[PDB]
Design a protein around this ligand. Structure first.
Ligand code: HEM
Length: 153
């Protein structure tokens, strides 16, 4: 369970993401695909992209980055009270997209990497620890839902 002070560190860096969620989403997805290229294979819409340049020019990838980060932002703003938000997300990602917990760890690592690079003014050590806690809680609750849904993540 996160403290309110930890939630505020999470929400204060998310406020900067929201200055330009599209640009942050491009950076985060591209970082994920460069660090863990196997994850790109899950996105049938744009798994054909070969280079970071193609990735940056992809309108579909940009829209996906907005979709991801906006859904995650809604979850974070619930400050752990995210049962309703996790239901459809767990179901689609367990059953339709088939995203292992290991890949949610990968995208969490990409989010932390991009925030560390872009936002040193709001992502010092304490803030990064709070974000890690929030993302661990997200993955913990998602993994429990995966099991309820019949998916070993
Ligand atoms: C913070 C973690 C994540 C969040 C909040 C998130 C959120 C979403 C949302 C809102 C959608 C659209 C609605 C839906 O299908 O449920 C979506 C679609 C999708 N997600 Fe995720 N996602 C996350 C992580 C991942 C990861 C790590 C992968 C793959 C490695 C992935 C693969 C996909 C795919 C393939 C789609 C369908 C894209 C398409 O329409 O072609 N997701 N995600």
């Amino acid at each position: 369970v996160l403290s309110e002070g930890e939630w505020q560190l999470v929400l204060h860096v998310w406020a900067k993401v929201e200055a330009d969620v599209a640009g942050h989403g491009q950076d985060i997805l591209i970082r994920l695909f460069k660090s863990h290229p196997e994850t790109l294979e899950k996105f049938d819409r744009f798994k054909h992209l070969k280079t970071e340049a193609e990735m940056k020019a992809s309108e579909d990838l940009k829209k996906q980055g907005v979709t991801v980060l906006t859904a995650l932002g809604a979850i974070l703003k619930k400050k752990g009270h995210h049962e309703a938000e996790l239901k459809p997300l767990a179901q689609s990602h367990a059953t339709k997209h088939k995203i292992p917990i290991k890949y949610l760890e990968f995208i969490s690592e990409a989010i932390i990497h991009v925030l560390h690079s872009r936002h040193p003014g709001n992502f010092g050590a304490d803030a990064q620890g709070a974000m890690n806690k929030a993302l661990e809680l997200f993955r913990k609750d998602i993994a429990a839902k995966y099991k309820e849904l019949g998916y070993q993540g």
